[PDB]
Every structure is written in C-alpha cells, then in structure tokens.
Amino acid sequence: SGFRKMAFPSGKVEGCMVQVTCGTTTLNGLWLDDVVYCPRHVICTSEDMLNPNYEDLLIRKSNHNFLVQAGNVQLRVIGHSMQNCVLKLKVDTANPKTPKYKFVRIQPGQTFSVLACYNGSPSGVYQCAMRPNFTIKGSFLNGSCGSVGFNIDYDCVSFCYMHHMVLPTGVHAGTDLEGNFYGPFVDRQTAQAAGTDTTITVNVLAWLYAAVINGDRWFLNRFTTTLNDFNLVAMKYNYEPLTQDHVDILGPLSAQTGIAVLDMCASLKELLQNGMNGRTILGSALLEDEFTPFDVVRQCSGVTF
C-alpha cells in the first residue's frame, strides 16, 4: 500500500566512504579492498580547474601527498594511478567493511541510489535517474564530490556513478567507477551544454501501472492506440520513443493489472494532450519518470537483499 521514491539501504556503502585530501582539496572517496577511488580533480587548485593538464598535475604529486581518512583512522598509499577521470590510490589496508561489489555502466533512464557525503561522512540517501541527456538532478553542495551512486542486487552492491561536477545550469555530471563520464562532459570549469532532456516514456508508463495497483485509475481511457501513433505524440512532447523492448519490459505489470501496454499508452497520450485538469496521480500533479518498471515491481512485490 502507497508509493514512495525509495532508496536502497545504504549501510554497505556507508562503510566504504573515506575523506580524500590532496594539497588543499578535500572530497569523498570510495575505499574498496586496497584501493580508494575519487574524482581526479581533487589534485586541482580552483586555478587548475579552468584548464587542467591532469597528466602534468598528477606528476607534481606522489603517494605521500594524498591524505585518506576513514573516520579517525588514517590510511597509507603505496601506488597511485589515473584511470580516465578517476584517481585510484593503492593503500596498505584492505577495507574490512568491503561488500561484494561490481562496477557497472548504467543506461540512460536507469535509476540508482546516491549516498551524499561531505568530508567522507554520509549525510543522506536519495533515488535518482540517469537522465536521457546523461545528467542527474541531484542535491550536491561543495565537497559532495566523489559521492557514489549504486544499486543492490541480492548481496552485491553495483556501483554505477561517481559525482564530479555541477554544470553552470545547476544539474550534475560524473562518471562510472572506471572514470568514463556519462555524457559529453569533461572535468574542466568551462561552459558545457547538457543538451535537450526527454521524458523517460517507459518509466512514466511503469508509474501509471504503479498508480493502477494502488487504486488510482481515473486516467484509464476507453480509447486505445498503436506504437507508431503513440510515438508521433511522444516526439511532440519530448518523450523518448517507445520500442518493443520497452513493451516487453512492461509485460509483468501488464499481466498483474490486466491492462495491455498499448492501452496504458493510449491513457498516456490523453494525459499528454489534455494535461491533468488539476487532478493528481499517486499524490503528484505531473507525470513521474524516475521509476523503472523494475523499481515499480520491487516496491509492489516487497523484494529484499
């Protein structure tokens, strides 16, 4: 009963969060086995950030220039490395709090939990989506940098995101845990175009299914539609095109609710065309696109870890 934006439990990530200080710069790092991961821009002065040569900057640094704190512990570095936009600090001590973990590159539209940190200390947890334009709309103050995004499958934390940048426009960009940026972004203080964001059509449909499951059904129309005709309306309202992969992924919600995907699509179209008339769906006056069909199923079936 009820439907909330729900984060994964954060304990297994909390015990991996370290404070990283190189020269003056201090931000969050991820301590897994014998390696601390952090944004490579920790080696930058505000002046460096304007036009950084990371290769050159990293050279004027050695192992002993990096202060990695875990609470009141102080760790020791024995091998530093730059993988794309992440700094890998090889330390002597394996994190005894290290969970089963993988690094994953997620797709636009997918969701993850962010454990937001300041000085390697957890402040809070929230759910977000990789936007279609590879930004995220998060909550990040100075020093939040190196905060990580993750999913939990079973026993296994899947790290998918590290926060690097706020864009002049207020939205966020960062990397996978191999330090490849999501999107066209670079770790440099220069104007960077996010580009046109679209609504994650498959997520809005997931959420409409969620609404039906929790008794919110006012928007089910007698009409139906076709994929081509729906995608005509979708393109007008900067909704991502819907594919058969999308219809397939919604199959189980279709089966639980007895509502054909294309029927739900005809409901969505009327909503895109007529707006909401000032009514609400699951407490919201706008169409929500930050739940996956997987998230909706997890919350509705009570999956645990």
| Residue ranges binding a copy of itself (CB under 8 A) | 1-12, 14-15, 115-119, 121-126, 128, 137-144, 166, 170-172, 214-215, 275, 278, 280, 283-286, 298-305
* Closest C-alpha among 157, 151, 146 to residue 33: 157
Distance CA 66, CA 26 (A): 10
Q: Can 44 be counted among the known catalytic residues? A: no
CB 49, CB 42: distance < 8 Å? no
Closest CB 145 distance from a copy of itself, rounded Å: 12
Contacts of residue 117, defined as CB under 8 A and 6 or more positions apart, other chains included, come to 17, 28, 123, 144, 146, 147
Closest CB 76 distance from a copy of itself, rounded Å: 24
Using the minimum distance from each CB to a copy of itself, give the nearer residue, 147 or 225.
Answer: 147
The residue from 38, 41, 85, 128 that is catalytic is: 41
Distance CA 159, CA 152 (A): 9
Q: Would you say how long the chain is, in residues? A: 305
Using the minimum distance from each CB to a copy of itself, give the nearer residue, 141 or 193.
Answer: 141
Using the minimum distance from each CB to a copy of itself, give the nearer residue, 138 or 174.
Answer: 138
Distance CA 141, CA 162 (A): 14
Q: Can 80 be counted among the known catalytic residues? A: no
The residue from 145, 163, 164, 265 that is catalytic is: 145
Closest CB 305 distance from a copy of itself, rounded Å: 6
Closest CB 154 distance from a copy of itself, rounded Å: 11
Q: Coil, strand or helix: which one is 110?
A: coil
Amino acid in position 221: N
Using the minimum distance from each CB to a copy of itself, give the nearer residue, 6 or 260.
Answer: 6
The catalytic site residues sit at 41, 145
